[PDB]
Amino acid sequence: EDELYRQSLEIISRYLREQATGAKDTKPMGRSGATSRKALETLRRVGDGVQRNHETAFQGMLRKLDIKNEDDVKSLSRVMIHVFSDGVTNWGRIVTLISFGAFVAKHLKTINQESCIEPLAESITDVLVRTKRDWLVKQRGWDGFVEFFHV
Numbered sequence: 001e002d003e004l005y006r007q008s009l010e011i012i013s014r015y016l017r018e019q020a021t022g023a024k025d026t027k028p029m030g031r032s033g034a035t036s037r038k039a040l041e042t043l044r045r046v047g048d049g050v051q052r053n054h055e056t057a058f059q060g061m062l063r064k065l066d067i068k069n070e071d072d073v074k075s076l077s078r079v080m081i082h083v084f085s086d087g088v089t090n091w092g093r094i095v096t097l098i099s100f101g102a103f104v105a106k107h108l109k110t111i112n113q114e115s116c117i118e119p120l121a122e123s124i125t126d127v128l129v130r131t132k133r134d135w136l137v138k139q140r141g142w143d144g145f146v147e148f149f150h151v
């Protein structure tokens with residue numbers, strides 16, 4: 001099918017959900033689980049740092065987007081394409097894309113619109129994979145992501 005898309009969605013979906021609920025999903029990973037597990041660990045370390053280092057900017061952009069419902073959540077894909085896709089690609093910007101998504105995911109829980117988190121993860125994945133596949137493939141995908149941030 002599309003293994004890069006499938007793996008990307010599982011990783012992003014899980015990180016967003018875990019960020020919003022504060023609990024880990026004990027369900028096993030699908031294909032390429034070992035890598036996905038390392039990718040999630042990486043996001044918990046780096047993504048979490050991003051949300052703090054840029055807390056003020058993140059809080060400001062969130063207020064800007066004024067997210068209250070499903071229509072508002074749907075409006076985010078155009079903004080992601082405008083800001084993320086139309087720019088240089090490097091792991092740092094991909095981490096910001098996902099980190100702000102988690103920031104939004106937490107917001108969705110506060111306003112009791114939790115059922116929008118999964119659709120949101122899907123939208124982030126679409127933007128990332130469908131507009132930056134060449135780069136991702138060249139950078140060795142998630143294996144490369146894990147390698148890049150290795151400590």
Ligand SMILES: O=C(O)[C@H](O)c1ccc2c(c1)N(CC1CCC1)C[C@@]1(CCCc3cc(Cl)ccc31)CO2
Nearest residue numbers: 057058061076079080083084093096097100101104
């Ligand atoms: O190039 C830049 O400026 C940065 O490097 C950069 C890179 C990616 C990126 C953003 C910035 N942003 C903007 C920043 C300002 C505080 C968050 C969030 C983004 C756009 C809004 C909507 C949206 C909604 C969701 Cl669910 C996720 C990501 C995003 C698009 O992802």
